[PDB]
Symmetry: C5
């Protein structure tokens, strides 16, 4: 019934970005803030819990919807396939993934990974009591592949996920991707930056 | 003696949900509160310890009660078979499983997993001192499988397990499963939500 | 010299209890209190460090004292053989094993495992200042095997291991194994319960 | 298209330093301070988050730019190749690597590893309030390979990475490599030492 | 050039103590105090960071200095060879190894392991303010092997490694090995006990 798995992994090396030369693997990135845990005004850091949304197309993982019974989509362990090496640029703590590390794959080869993470970032929380509000920037981006290899494209930033209570309230979330040439390598480097603004409830 | 193990694992890939098409693996879910550890009124979080009761039928794991001596049920490591990818939609800390990660299996193929977990959840503990009491919702649910693949069915919520002493006392536990829709993915995702109400003893 | 190891592991699956049908593997259990670290009167929990003493007979692990030079007993990693799945039924934290995870095995097949553990238990430490003293019960027991598969038999509780200083002093340690029956299995269940009584030194 | 990976790992044992005899593997070391988290004046320790810049040449990892399509550089998991066993001599906590553990490799065989680390060091933070400033020395160095096997060569210390805000401000960063001697062995052990001086903003 | 590794591991099982019968593997043990982090007078525990010096002779790991080019000594991961199962008897926290887990081996077969560890011990720190000073005993010893299998021999205790500043100052370090005849089995158990005395600087 599911010899599909045996086949999908057969000739697969997850350390290889599935590019079809000059055809950069495009990954649709998106972050959804769930809650702001703490704010260390003393050391300038915020504890955040978010919901990463990543989707890309792995040509190595497609199959004939017919050659296999009624197998539309399968559930695979991220440790089995290639997954975007996105990293938090201003992080000061290792990311702690809260949810099961599993991804969904199409019969056509479309992967979807939605981990819930709690991670701490370096940020200026000076004006977290002022009505103006403290602003934190969460910069994400590939850690090794450039624009031609891995193309980052941000999608609709969902904010309806934020906790209703919570000691803090969201004043605004921006999100904007930028490509920077970096002094070297003819190839640019993309990155999505979520700008979160919040203030203590009073 | 027990060549049963060698056989049960022979052609098994634990990353594959044991469905036989138009036959969704039904898992009987149930949570039993053991004790409320702490309540962070400052950050709005509760530390809870409970033990989850999960049971399902794995057709790949059945055997002839005769072909094998007097082997009625075996004790296998969850890392060896498929196990429901249930997750706490609203958790803010990785689950810490306290008990041995072993499951029991019938000669017919009925698995049973009863782990004791300590995990922290985001919750509004404002009125934990009021006689009305603070209410927390623990939402659980499959993470990659929809209704047709994995059917969640809640069973009798046991409450006789709660610690007699404890700084807190249980005012009420509800528990109710709902089939909810999410953007994308044609199918809907079943989730069981345990609503716990407690107040500080005084 | 030691092809003994290559042979002892050859046809071994550590997930299989060494029962030779109608011959329940009997494990001699025993706990030795080393020190009481802390007592959280606010949340009702004790931090304990104890010395577990477990011994059983693995028929799969015996050899001819002659066929092998002068190899009387070997030192093997618990991850290599079957080991009792005993669990603390009243624990609120994963057990932290302090010592090397190695076991000793006889030429006849008698295993011995003595790990030092620090674990926290839920307990009523209300009267820890009273001269009467607070009493904690540490209930241990298999997690999946019943009486016919794994027979728990408690042996002499050693108390001479307790720390002379320490903020607390031992008023008494009981220890008593009990078997029961429940709704199911027609299968009984063994469990050893160490009852520790202590009070703050003043 | 990337059978390159299958080939690069084929005859590779990452526990073997890629010295091509009498030609010591030279690794270009460099640290970049990102932020000083806390200073424990009571126990004399600093919590630091730095950027580590390491680059070396692995002759075992080179390939014909032509024999392989347009594969210029690949992204490999440090657990797959040999990587400098540099250690922090005066660390009092295990290093916590924040970024993805991946390295970049040239078609010629030049590896590049840039991990972001948060680690705590033993240091005299007495005068952290004085205008003179507290000074900490972060001594790094290979731990098992001597001068002839692994040659450490420090490069330009980048300081533009430091956090603008932060409770502390950098008064000076030195950095100087020294070839020293030890009471364990008969051989020179090189080591780069970054001397950071900072004071609390007031 | 280094097929030496492929050969050194070929017929090796690291769970087997390398005793060439009637020849107890003698390990030269030695501890060097680096710094005393904290002292919990409330719970009677000290946080210590030391430097373990262990050396022994593994006959299975020797080679012809000629049969292999100019390979004098190699750097191997402790997970690859047998290493003394020494344990901290009165430890109340798992040992946290700070340095790279690698060992050095002679062409003759002499292993050397020098890990830096931070571990907490149960100790009477009552008089840490008195001029007399608090005294802590760090008892180490094999966990499964007795005198005939593993012979512990302490060597010069180096104290020049202690941190100059530090809230505490060393009043004295003794170190003395004792052979402790336990219950049964005529072969006793050797254990080295480092007695450290310190007082708060004032
Ligand atoms: C995808 O699978 C279908 C069904 O197996 C393949 O169809 C074959 O060709 C025609 C069109 O359906 C049928 O008459 C044959 O009977 C099918 N052959 C088989 C093996 O049943 C189709 O060719 C496949 N296409 C791809 C992309 O591989
Ligand atoms: C899955 O593949 C389908 C093609 O059938 C495509 O419409 C979609 O973009 C992919 N994602 C889904 C529907 O989850
Ligand atoms: C099932 O058990 C029967 C009991 O009579 C026995 O003959 C045989 O081993 C098994 N038969 C099949 C087809 O599974
Ligand atoms: C186990 O198998 C038996 C076989 O008759 C079945 O009746 C029962 O519902 C299954 N569940 C358990 C764990 O008892
Ligand atoms: C034990 O080993 C000896 C070899 O000295 C052999 O003669 C004898 O048959 C063996 N007996 C058993 C119990 O296997
Ligand atoms: C081996 O088991 C026998 C059981 O009779 C016992 O006498 C002997 O002391 C044991 N050896 C050990 C565990 O040291
Ligand atoms: C690389 O491969 C080409 C194949 O066209 C071959 O001609 C050439 O000798 C190789 N170049 C080097 C650097 O050896
Ligand atoms: C690899 O790095 C070296 C460093 O000098 C550089 O010269 C070379 O161009 C890089 N790779 C190749 C062969 O292009
Ligand atoms: C050592 O190596 C030499 C030359 O390879 C050869 O005589 C023999 O293999 C070895 N002899 C001894 C005594 O180790």
């Amino acid at each position: 019934q599911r010899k599909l798995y045996k086949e999908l992994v057969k000739n697969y090396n997850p350390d290889v970005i599935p590019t079809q030369r000059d055809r950069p693997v495009t990954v649709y990135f998106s972050l959804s803030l769930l809650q702001i845990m703490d704010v260390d005004e003393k050391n300038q850091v915020v504890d955040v819990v978010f919901w990463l949304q990543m989707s890309w197309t792995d040509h190595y993982l497609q199959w004939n919807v017919s050659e296999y019974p009624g197998v539309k989509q399968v559930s695979v362990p991220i440790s089995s396939l290639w997954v975007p090496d996105l990293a938090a640029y201003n992080a000061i703590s290792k990311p702690e993934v809260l949810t099961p590390q599993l991804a969904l794959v199409n019969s056509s080869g479309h992967v979807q990974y939605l981990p819930s993470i709690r991670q701490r970032f370096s940020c200026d929380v000076s004006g977290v009591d002022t009505e103006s509000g403290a602003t934190c920037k969460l910069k994400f981006g590939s850690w090794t592949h450039h624009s031609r290899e891995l193309d980052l494209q941000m999608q609709e930033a969902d904010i309806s996920g934020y906790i209703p209570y919570s000691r803090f309230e969201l004043v605004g979330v921006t999100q904007k991707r930028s490509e920077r040439f970096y002094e070297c390598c003819k190839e640019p480097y993309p990155d999505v930056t979520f700008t979160v603004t919040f203030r203590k409830k009073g």
